[PDB]
Amino acid sequence: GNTTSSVILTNYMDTQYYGEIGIGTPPQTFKVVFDTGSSNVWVPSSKCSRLYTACVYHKLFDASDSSSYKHNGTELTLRYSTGTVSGFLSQDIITVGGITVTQMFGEVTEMPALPFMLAEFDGVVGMGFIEQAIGRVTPIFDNIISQGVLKEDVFSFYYNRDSSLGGQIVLGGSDPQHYEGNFHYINLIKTGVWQIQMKGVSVGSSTLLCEDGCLALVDTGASYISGSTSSIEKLMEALGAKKRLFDYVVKCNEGPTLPDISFHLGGKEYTLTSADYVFQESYSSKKLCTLAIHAMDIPPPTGPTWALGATFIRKFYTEFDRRNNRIGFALAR
Amino acid sequence: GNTTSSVILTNYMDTQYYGEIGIGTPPQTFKVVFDTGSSNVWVPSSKCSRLYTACVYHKLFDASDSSSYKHNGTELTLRYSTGTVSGFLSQDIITVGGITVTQMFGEVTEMPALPFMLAEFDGVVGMGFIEQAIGRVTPIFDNIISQGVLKEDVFSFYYNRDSESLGGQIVLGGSDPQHYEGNFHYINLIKTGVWQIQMKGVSVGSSTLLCEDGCLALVDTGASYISGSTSSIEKLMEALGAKKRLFDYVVKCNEGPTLPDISFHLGGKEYTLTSADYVFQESYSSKKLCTLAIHAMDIPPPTGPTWALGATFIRKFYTEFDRRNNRIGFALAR
Ligand SMILES: CC(C)C[C@H](O)[C@H](O)[C@H](CC1CCCCC1)NC(=O)[C@@H](CC(=O)N(CC(=O)N(C)C)[C@@H](C)c1ccccc1)Cc1csc(N)n1
Ligand SMILES: CC(C)C[C@H](O)[C@H](O)[C@H](CC1CCCCC1)NC(=O)[C@@H](CC(=O)N(CC(=O)N(C)C)[C@@H](C)c1ccccc1)Cc1csc(N)n1
């Protein structure tokens, strides 16, 4: 068809980006995270206990209120790198932008404080493929395609640096207002995951890692870029950042001194200068500044893999092309 | 007819949206706000006393330089919710978005510093009905409607979010499909003469906490914030745990991102604002107060008492003001 649906995104501290969706009739509105790293749609259930403070502090779905609702009740546990959520599976109509589709989705009943008490949004909308779908429920994008409608079988993401417009997702295409140049594509290693092959990470001048290829997930639901523990160690040493309990820090004023990091993808370099990978809250010689790179050990079958998260997507407007199973990149604006 | 014309607006910090017009021959250019809550056109006059500092800081209109001017002289006072200006009527040629009308406007000679010294713009273009016109002078849109050039008898508003982009835009004669998505939902006005509509309820969180039984809502582009009566905003504010500063309501910045949705039940549909939509999240500090883009305003009868949906609302919802059929349509802006 010749349609395109923009979804406005809020950016909260550059770590969380979310937009609204409406479930039901008349719709209920939830804040969600559009995650290319998974394929299930889930929101909190009014049937969630207050025992969990997470539910107590999150919008909940009230099936009673939905004209269009449909019982189902299959139980489900969705497991994320950072947490787990369990609930059961309902159906209703979900409103995304100007689009509407009958979605099967989970109504969450168990949600831990760690990490959900740190989430500002309510649930998540899996932009992944059906192969990774807990319960072989069809992911929302699949359902949207079916309905014809969209001009192209792709979706794009723009993430902004927090200061304005926090970001934007375009279903059916891309916004030429939010990127410079033209896209360069990198094919999927295999279908089922949004993961491409990378063939080197350079620190400044030199390929320091992933010399003979490695994998990268392009993950819109990952705050930071991660790499295996061993690569991050190596990398940080080369940068001279230091482990501070949780993260790697650098003296604020020394931020500008760090080298550029380049990801070699599909024959091109994607370069990040320290300004893109250090959160320079100051430039004081008296303060420590945080790096938005973290180690993450992803289990097979998926990992060991690099995950290119919001850190990278802030820099490169991203296009996920389902038609050709390829991911494209252009410099954002 | 067949024209469609647009005015591009500048967005000053989310609170002032102004476009330009030209008056006279040769044209004298002015920054103006296009306001649906009023129907007069005015600019500051070269006759304005320099004793009004607002008249030292804004472009003044000088008839002595205009060949197309026709003197009128009739005095007129313009009262707005937040201030007043006085002047007299003049007539000259006004160019808006490419359209040229011979318009009767006011030359303001008395301009107070509050609010005007805070104004990035010079005057106002009232986009309301002749019913609201001081002096019974014909409103500009109506004059345009007389020319028979517009494709449609509508005008729409796009208000954008800022930057460190295109500020907003008025389309004269239609709408702009690049700035909205989905379909319009039309509400009919209660009656001609005022851009007001029936509202059945306002919800904080879940609960139609307010406006049970029903209320009025003015859709007014000439207002930065959304406004309710004082007693309604009193309730609202308490629900959000907001704290009344001089002229505004505030909240601890850190509390900001979790404030509950507020819904406006209009024409059977529900218009929802999320915390992101109505809090000026200028920081996350637990140690700073952040402004809410909502406030009280007691509008006297006949229009009031009412709610007024200002730039806060229009920002999320593209608005079409339809004269042909006397109605307002909202769509989801993009
Ligand atoms: C194949 C897997 C790598 C896919 C992965 O499970 C999914 O992308 C999953 C989706 C998330 C959507 C919001 C609800 C939590 C889960 N992201 C994740 O699990 C990433 C979560 C994630 O990015 N965060 C923030 C974070 O890590 N930093 C550094 C702020 C966690 C704290 C989170 C949790 C809850 C609310 C908000 C944030 C961790 C990660 C893995 S690889 C990497 N670079 N980062
Ligand atoms: C029937 C009436 C409600 C109609 C009302 O008089 C008109 O819409 C009137 C026209 C304005 C055009 C710009 C010059 C000032 C006057 N707007 C208004 O009076 C709104 C003015 C208005 O919104 N402002 C900004 C303001 O209130 N804040 C909080 C930034 C005034 C203070 C202002 C000051 C400085 C510069 C510019 C504007 C106040 C309001 C009333 S209902 C509501 N939600 N907000």
Q: Is B225 in the pocket of ligand 2 (CB under 6 A)?
A: yes
How far is the CA of B282 from the CAs of A160, A278, B223, B274, B291, in angstroms? 16, 21, 21, 16, 8
Pocket of ligand 1 (CB under 6 A): A 15-16, 33, 35, 37-38, 80-83, 115, 118-119, 124, 219, 221-224, 226, 294, 296, 298, 302, 307, 309
B142 is catalytic: no
Q: Which residues, 6+ apart, have CB-to-CB distance to B85 below 8 Å? A: B42, B77, B78, B106, B108, B110, B111, B112, B116
- CB of B252 closer than 8 Å to CB of B245: no
Q: Is the backbone peptide bond immediately before B44 cis, with ω within 30 degrees of 0?
A: no
Residue A67: other Cβ atoms inside 10 A: 9
- CB of B18 closer than 8 Å to CB of B121: yes
Q: Is the backbone peptide bond immediately before B302 cis, with ω within 30 degrees of 0?
A: yes
Ligand nearest to the CA of B300: 2
End-to-end CA distance of chain B: 28
Resolution (A): 2.4
Q: Which residues, 6+ apart, have CB-to-CB distance to A253 below 8 Å? A: A282, A283, A284, A285
The Cα–Cα gap between B32 and B22 comes to 10
In the beta sheet, which residues pair with residue B204? B207, B262
How much is the CA Rg of chain B, to the nearest whole Å? 20
Quote the ligand 1 centre to A223 CA distance (angstroms): 6
A199 backbone dihedrals φ, ψ, rounded to 5°: -135, 55
CA torsion sign, A266 to A171 to A169 to A176? positive
CATH fold of B176-333 reads Cathepsin D, subunit A; domain 1 (2.40.70)
Helices (H), A76-139: 113-116
The Cα–Cα gap between B290 and B143 comes to 43
Name the class of domain B4-175: mainly beta
CA torsion sign, B311 to B13 to B158 to A310? negative
- The distance from CA B18 to its chain's CA centroid, rounded to whole angstroms, is 10
The domains spanning A4-174 and A175-332 adopt the same CATH topology: yes
Residue B56, token pair as written in the block? 């030292």
Q: According to the CATH classification, is domain A4-174 in 2.40.70.10?
A: yes
Distance from the Cα of B30 to chain A's closest Cα (Å) equals 28
H-helix or E-strand containing A229? helix A229-239
Residue B236, token pair as written in the block? 């609202």
Residue A13, token pair as written in the block? 């501290």
- Find tokens 């950016």 and name the residue: A11
- What does A249-265 look like in DSSP terms, one character per residue? EEEGGGGGGSPPEEEEE
- Find tokens 């279903």 and name the residue: A171
CATH fold of A175-332 reads Cathepsin D, subunit A; domain 1 (2.40.70)
- Is A301 strand, coil or helix? coil
Q: Which of B81, B111, B249, B306 to mutate to test the pocket of ligand 2 (most atoms within 8 A of CB)?
A: B81
Q: Is B284 in the pocket of ligand 2 (CB under 6 A)?
A: no
The Cα–Cα gap between A301 and B259 comes to 40
A35 is catalytic: yes
- Find tokens 């699949």 and name the residue: A142
Q: Which of A198, A184, A101, A109 is nearest to A150 (CA)?
A: A101
- Is B234 strand, coil or helix? helix
Distance from the Cα of A43 to chain B's closest Cα (Å) equals 16
- Find tokens 């959900």 and name the residue: A116
Quote the ligand 1 centre to A82 CA distance (angstroms): 6
CA torsion sign, A28 to B219 to B328 to B232? positive
Q: Which of A112, A94, A105, A108 is nearest to A20 (CA)?
A: A94
Q: Which of B15, B35, B82, B278 to mutate to test the pocket of ligand 2 (most atoms within 8 A of CB)?
A: B82
Give domain limits for chain B.
4-175, 176-333
Q: Are β-strands A214-218 and A306-308 bridged in parallel, bridged antiparallel, or unpaired? A: parallel
How far is the CA of A314 from the CAs of A157, A175, A328, B162, B277, in angstroms? 9, 15, 14, 18, 22
Residue A250, token pair as written in the block? 């650098």
- CB of A226 closer than 8 Å to CB of A303: no
For residue B9, the number of C-alpha atoms closer than 13 Å in the C-beta half-sphere is: 30
In the beta sheet, which residues pair with residue A214? A198
H-helix or E-strand containing A238? helix A229-239
